[PDB]
Amino acid sequence: DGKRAINYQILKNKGLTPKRNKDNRNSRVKKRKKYQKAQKKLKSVRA
Amino acid sequence: PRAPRTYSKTYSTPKRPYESSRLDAELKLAGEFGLKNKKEIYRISFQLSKIRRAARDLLTRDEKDPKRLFEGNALIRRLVRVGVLSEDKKKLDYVLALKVEDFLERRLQTQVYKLGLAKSVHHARVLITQRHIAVGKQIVNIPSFMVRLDSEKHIDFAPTSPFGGARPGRVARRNAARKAEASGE
Amino acid sequence: AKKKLHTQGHNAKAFAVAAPGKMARTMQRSSDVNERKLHVPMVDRTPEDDPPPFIVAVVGPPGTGKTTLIRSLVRRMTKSTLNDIQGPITVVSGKHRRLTFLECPADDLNAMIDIAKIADLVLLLIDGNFGFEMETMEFLNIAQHHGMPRVLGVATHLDLFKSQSTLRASKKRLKHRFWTEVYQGAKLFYLSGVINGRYPDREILNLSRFISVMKFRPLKWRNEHPYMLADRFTDLTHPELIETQGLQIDRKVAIYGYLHGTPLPSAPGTRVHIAGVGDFSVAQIEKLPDPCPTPFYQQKLDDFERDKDKLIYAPMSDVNIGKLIYMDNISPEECIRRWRGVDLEKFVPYFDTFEKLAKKWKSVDAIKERFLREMNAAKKEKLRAQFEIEEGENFKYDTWYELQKAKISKQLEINNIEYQEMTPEQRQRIEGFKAGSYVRIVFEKVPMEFVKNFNPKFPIVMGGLLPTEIKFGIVKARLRRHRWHKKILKTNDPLVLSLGWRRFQTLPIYTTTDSRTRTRMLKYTPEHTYCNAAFYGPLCSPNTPFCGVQIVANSDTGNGFRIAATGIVEEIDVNIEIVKKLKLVGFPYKIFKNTAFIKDMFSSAMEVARFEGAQIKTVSGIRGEIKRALSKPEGHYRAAFEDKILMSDIVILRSWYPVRVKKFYNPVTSLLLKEKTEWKGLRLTGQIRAAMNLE
RNA sequence: UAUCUGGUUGAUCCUGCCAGUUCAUAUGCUUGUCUCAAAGAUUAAGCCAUGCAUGUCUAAGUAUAAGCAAUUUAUACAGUGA
RNA sequence: GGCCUACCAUGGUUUCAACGGGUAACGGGGAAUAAGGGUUCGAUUCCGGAGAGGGAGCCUGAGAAACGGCUACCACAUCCAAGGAAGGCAGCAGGCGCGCAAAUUACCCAAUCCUAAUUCAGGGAGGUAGUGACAAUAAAUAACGAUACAGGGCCCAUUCGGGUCUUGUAAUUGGAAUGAGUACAAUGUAAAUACCUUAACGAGGAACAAUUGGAGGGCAAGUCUGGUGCCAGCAGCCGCGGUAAUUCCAG
């Protein structure tokens, strides 16, 4: 069609964001991937 | 001109913003009970905080004062009701004790994990917010539902959803729509 | 606290506030509201008596339809349905107000850039179903750099949407998106349908009322340059001149319009620029009665003497010492002899002889006017008079902005009581055709292309050029890649840019400053910040913002963003020394400890001698100097470094080679061209390679 | 201006000073879903275009509408009703 | 009832603060703040009072010193044929008050109730939706396996090691799940809209594209400043070429 379209850049209008994780997106995962990461440390501090 | 809709907030935030011990202490809880917020801990601290205040007060009144007897009893039975206060320690000097973990242990989130149907604290989150697991025939999608002793037996998958009969589900059926449309007619 | 308070004459303690809290909390909030009211002080220079029509210019995507939108606004203000609207049209909407609509072309950036310099108020319609197209976004960006007009957006195609819930969400999105482009708190009106060929009266009535109280602010460019919009176009040539010379002539042209902004001086011979044709000059200036007169204005004319049917004007569409001084036949000898009845090169004016002056100036009693119970009173009075003379300037508001604003307001009515005394003959020449005087100014040397290829649908304005602006020097501007535009700009790559009243492509050059010791050219543009730049072209005032584009031909746009470079100008000269860095590389072919023999950097042993003592450095970062031209081979030289150079190492001598600015200049001449879209100028470096198939 | 850490010494202390440490207005950025939903402020109780915000009839005060209606016992009236 | 008048008398209040002045003063229920004692605030959902541009006067009436009543003056201010006539948003909405600012000129009497001659009419009272993160509530942006080496475990260790119980960092992988949204229908509603339901649709990073602040380094044939070589310092959107050009400390 002849009618010109919005670019995804100028729609959301997010310019110059530094690269981020996928895991800030769902907080219940970053809680999971922290505790599962901070349970490996617990096996290393004590037995 | 209409009666105020009343409200109030349900959490309180730490005075000391950056205390490293409290921060590690908080995170471990989050990673244990599948929380997403420091607020989900802030919230409970606040709940506890008033419960403890009530109890402190009641304790100052004479033994067997009517209010104390009446309002203390009430608070104890409310706590035993949901499995926060053990049967033995049923007399409010231990509600004066009572930890945050005792409260977090009773969330529908954690209760689903204890049964093992979810198989994880986080699998327990995702299931709940996704319309599986119920109490009666009544679906519950709130992780903080707080499982009252006599419904613990009734945590189970819902009649709807997969996992509880009903039907597989659009993402699976969509595949069975590529099974019979590729290999057949 | 006991005696500090009592130091002042009034009891300090007695005066206090009943509430500390309310006094203090209210005091901060009131102050914030004020500070907000304060804005930097400006000048209006538009007349209180005869204001021009505030030009309102509908813009937007073409398939929405702005012709039927302007026909549903003029039929509710004058109750007279129009048809096939083309060109600028003036309608009286009120007892003192009378706006002038102007349908832009949507297809032409050559006119879209042109209109935003003059549109006082711009009505922007964005399709509700299609949101914002590129043409809306492109127009908003160009308008902001030149000077922001008052924008009142509207949203056609609102009726189409199937579900009201989805429609409400879409309205919020456009309203929120509009706030970022313009100013937050500004809401675009929505029109439900065009079933009868016009919008609903209730929606239109609100839109007409909202526009009426616009009270547009004064743009900086518009109060420095006399401008006008051409109402009707007229060629005044003999057809016998046409039949003899055979369509080759440049035609004598009379043009008609309303002046604006600042007084266009009435001595014929000021140079003045048609947007999109070229630099012309005025030849004859004449003022005729305006077709549309406000009813309040008409009443005054009727009273002095002692038009209801036509409420709109759309011509393009179908229905003494001083007068003894300023003569040149009189000699200045005769001028004073006519007034009573010498070279300026000597500084002391002509006196009389000291014989005649000493006898005259025996007594000083002629000049004693200029120096500095009843009796007692008189004396006192005299003293008072002298005290005022002795200390008057020293002896003679709450907010500084309000005061310094009185430097403008007192400056306004001291024009007005001055102009009033003149007013019938002297004021007109002094007035010089003041803003809104519907003037008939005629031209000459307008090309044949302009009268042949003309349609009234595109506008034509005049820019009264300042004598600053009339020349051609290389300007020092600074600019960046407009961050919507994808590719970065290249040095020495032509760029159409709208600087002042002119639209033109020139060959810029993008010149950083190596920590303010010189002007080094880059090769590209720093892709997120302003770089200092330079380009040939016309000259302007400093602190003038421009907004330069890429390919403006509508045949070649694509879906990319058109506006590529925005910025202001810093200063202007006629020569900027501009430096490209070159470095001379060399390689060592015999090293020692702390002394190298470096080959093939210099060709002859004489070439080295022009360069000895030069602070050579290497890749590795060690310094040195080059000292003597080695003889027995013709090229090489001995150079002492600070430490042992390797064999694997590459010496580089920094140096500076000056460059030039290519003096190409090309006004766009858009509506001299026949097709009036798709004006194609100089191609980009990448485009020429594809055409010539180079790599 | 209380409470806490931190500082002058090669060190240990105390008095001693300096350094950090809400909920009310504005502004900035951001704003997917449910429910809930308020909405003042230049010491200007300043000024107001336009539209609306006060009208009202039962079996039961007044009907010759040259009003509508017709039938239904109605030649005083009797329905309905401006 | 000194409320007012006539006669007559000389009384009345005051350091236990009269009288006067100030108030960015309507009073109260109350608010915020948490050892206690206090301190500060209340124009503002309820009660009371007062006012309707400013003053005064008054008609009607049970009730007004009424202003969506009248009369006069003052100040504003509109209409005109110049003779005259007319207006009072501190109701609802809406506009101005500066030259740079932000709630809709929408729907209904279905509820709540009020008024009338009255079940019926009227009600911008009030309710409905629309409109900037005032405050408050609930709480997505992902969940699980397999594999490829790497581990720490642990039994053995004369010495290869990996092999099961999983700690998890992985640049190929694997199928499951779900609403954000889009949408038959029914429900909702005065009618709509949303919600609660729910057919059909709707997730792999190149989306259906999480933010807003903060700590820290690195890079150039770059620039600048100082220096007892090659260093020290500031710093670096800028280099040499190049912007349909570069894939580039993956960004």
From Swiss-Prot, chain A:
Localization per record: Nucleus, Nucleolus
Superkingdom: Eukaryota
Biased composition (Basic residues): 27-44
Region of interest: Disordered: 14-44
Described purpose of this protein according to its UniProt entry: Primarily required at the G2/M phase. Essential for viability: involved in nucleolar processing of pre-18S ribosomal RNA as part of the ribosomal small subunit (SSU) processome.
Similarity comment: family membership: Belongs to the SAS10 family.
Remaining remarks: When overexpressed, has a role in the structure of silenced chromatin. Overproduction causes derepression of gene expression at both HML and HMR, as well as at the rDNA locus and at telomeres.
Record's subunit section: Interacts with snoRNA U3. Interacts with MPP10. Component of the ribosomal small subunit (SSU) processome composed of at least 40 protein subunits and snoRNA U3.
Protein name per UniProt: Something about silencing protein 10
Recorded name of the encoding gene: SAS10
Swiss-Prot record, chain B:
Cited SMART domains: Ribosomal_S4, S4
Cellular component aspect of the GO annotation: 90S preribosome; cytoplasm; cytosol; cytosolic small ribosomal subunit; nucleolus; nucleoplasm; small-subunit processome
Major subcellular site: cytoplasm
S4 RNA-binding domain residues: 106-180
GO molecular function, one term: structural constituent of ribosome
Keywords: Cytoplasm, Isopeptide bond, Nucleus, Phosphoprotein, Ribonucleoprotein, Ribosomal protein, Ribosome biogenesis, RNA-binding, rRNA processing, rRNA-binding, Ubl conjugation
Region of interest: Disordered: 159-185
Modified residues (Phosphoserine): 183
Residue(s) of cross-link: Glycyl lysine isopeptide (Lys-Gly) (interchain with G-Cter in ubiquitin): 179
Location of this chain's protein in the cell: Cytoplasm; Nucleus, Nucleolus
Organism superkingdom: Eukaryota
GO biological process, one term: ribosomal small subunit biogenesis
InterPro entries reported for this sequence: Ribosomal_uS4 (IPR022801), Ribosomal_uS4_CS (IPR018079), Ribosomal_uS4_euk/arc (IPR005710), Ribosomal_uS4_N (IPR001912), S4_RNA-bd (IPR002942), S4_RNA-bd_sf (IPR036986)
More info: Present with 106000 molecules/cell in log phase SD medium.
Family: Belongs to the universal ribosomal protein uS4 family.
NCBIfam families in alphabetical order: PRK04051.1, uS4_arch
Assembly and binders: Component of the small ribosomal subunit (SSU). Mature yeast ribosomes consist of a small (40S) and a large (60S) subunit. The 40S small subunit contains 1 molecule of ribosomal RNA (18S rRNA) and 33 different proteins (encoded by 57 genes). The large 60S subunit contains 3 rRNA molecules (25S, 5.8S and 5S rRNA) and 46 different proteins (encoded by 81 genes). Interacts with snoRNA U3. uS11 interacts with MPP10. Component of the ribosomal small subunit (SSU) processome composed of at least 40 protein subunits and snoRNA U3.
Protein name per Swiss-Prot or TrEMBL: Small ribosomal subunit protein uS4A
Organism of derivation: Saccharomyces cerevisiae (strain ATCC 204508 / S288c)
From Swiss-Prot, chain C:
Free-text activity regulation comment from the record: Interactions with RCL1 stimulates its GTPase and U3 snoRNA binding activities. RCL1 activates BMS1 by promoting GDP/GTP exchange.
EC number annotated for this UniProt entry: 3.6.5.-
GO biological process entries: endonucleolytic cleavage in 5'-ETS of tricistronic rRNA transcript (SSU-rRNA, 5.8S rRNA, LSU-rRNA); endonucleolytic cleavage of tricistronic rRNA transcript (SSU-rRNA, 5.8S rRNA, LSU-rRNA); endonucleolytic cleavage to generate mature 5'-end of SSU-rRNA from (SSU-rRNA, 5.8S rRNA, LSU-rRNA); maturation of SSU-rRNA; maturation of SSU-rRNA from tricistronic rRNA transcript (SSU-rRNA, 5.8S rRNA, LSU-rRNA); regulation of rRNA processing; ribosomal small subunit biogenesis
Protein name: Ribosome biogenesis protein BMS1
Cellular component terms per the entry's GO annotation: 90S preribosome; cytoplasm; mitochondrion; nucleolus; nucleoplasm; nucleus; small-subunit processome
Species annotation: Saccharomyces cerevisiae (strain ATCC 204508 / S288c) (Baker's yeast)
Catalytic EC class: hydrolase
Phosphoprotein is among the record's keywords: yes
